[PDB]
């Protein structure tokens, strides 16, 4: 609930927004490199097919007309067709095979780039969230340092009040009626108050560190919760690298 | 550990993913016309393959009590990733129709062709966004190319259907098989 207040801060939300624009630029660059290659993949094949069709039609017309007008031309021309299609079937078999290569190398490279940016964004989010939290922890700690200094200030001035207070009412005590005991009572009062103030001073110092130790306790396990949050995010991003390796296979855009 | 897999009922099973991947492949979603999340192939390396009970046509209905009736395809794959080392699932146990497409200026049909990791057949992999197949909008990922211009491709190679589709010139008459 602390992390959520941290995760809706002005600086954090902007980094999220700048990360999402990065993500769009990558999709747009990936798509341009997609279309650049399909055009050339098709451009190449539609050349090779247009030419093969041209050669077959030329040979097909050659026997068709001569048959109307045979002998060896029938035998020779059909050898040229078997020669020519058998070669075409193996020009494309080679091309179609290398067009799978070009695509699959790209899609996996593209898929890798996208994985790495998603990982880099995750290291950038943990580092920001944490640095913000440490900065909050620093202005939390030394604000408390502040109270501790004023807490001592009030005590010293409070202790001065009692001591001066316990010296007027001792003068006004009528029951004394003697200087020798009065000299002693003042010595007795001064020593008792001096002891009391030093003990309350010692108890404040002890109390003050105790409460700062509690600040350390709260701060530590906020940072521990953020570190577990980043660990869980890394662990699941590994399971998409894992599922991606199984899904990987060759592919041919058509 | 309570029950084995039996058809007809909304079964509830649990798989131990452990250190290996779950290894499922999905089709469908709210974004698609299928309107169901359906297992399409079980990757042999995965955990459900170890488990042995999920076959290749099983309809997933919820993961960790997350109802997938509105989940898009992308939403459903993350639902598979967010599983802990243990997995909680609820499962249940072709549609053939024709699609004709005209090839665009430069690219072509604008779809990708692959084969199942283990099993024959040849299926649609990825649909290029501005593609000729995209603007028709009836094909989705996982659709089987049964025939192309009449010729049956059911037990054809990936090189076969790639070669036929790439070299085809005009309108391409496809038969498509989809899960249910
Ligand atoms: Au072309
Ligand atoms: Au960090
Ligand atoms: Au005063
Ligand atoms: Au985090
Ligand atoms: Au051909």
Residue numbers in the entry:
A (entry chain B): 6 to 74, 80 to 264
B (entry chain C): 271 to 363, 373 to 459
The authors write:
At the inner surface of fly photoreceptor rhabdomeric membranes, the master scaffold protein INAD (encoded by inaD for inactivation no after potential D and contains 5 PDZ domains arranged in tandem) forms stoichiometric multi-molecular complexes with phospholipase Cβ (NORPA), Ca2+-permeable transient receptor potential (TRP) channel and eye-specific protein kinase C (eye-PKC). Our biochemical and structural studies demonstrate that INADL PDZ89 forms a supramodule and binds to the entire C-terminal coiled-coil domain of PLCβ4 in a manner that is strikingly similar to that of the INAD–NORPA complex.
To elucidate the molecular mechanism governing the interaction between PLCβ4 and INADL, we determined the crystal structure of the INADL PDZ89–PLCβ4 CC-PBM complex. To facilitate the complex crystal growth, we also substituted the eight Lys residues in the α2 helix of PLCβ4 CC with Ala. Furthermore, we discovered that covalently linking INADL PDZ89 with the PLCβ4 CC8KA-PBM was necessary to obtain diffraction-quality crystals of the complex. Strikingly, the overall architecture of the PLCβ4 CC8KA-PBM–INADL PDZ89 complex is remarkably similar to that of the NORPA–INAD complex. In the complex, PDZ89 forms an integral structural unit and extensively binds to the CC-PBM domain of PLCβ4, burying a total of ~1211 Å2 surface area. In the complex, the formation of a supramodule between PDZ8 and PDZ9 is mediated by a number of hydrophobic residues from both domains. In site 1, the last four amino acids (ATVV) of the PLCβ4 PBM bind to the canonical αB/βB-pocket of PDZ9. In site 3, the carboxyl group of E1164 from α4 of the PLCβ4 CC forms hydrogen bonds with the backbone of the GLGL loop of PDZ8 by mimicking the classical carboxyl group–GLGF binding found in all PDZ–target interactions.
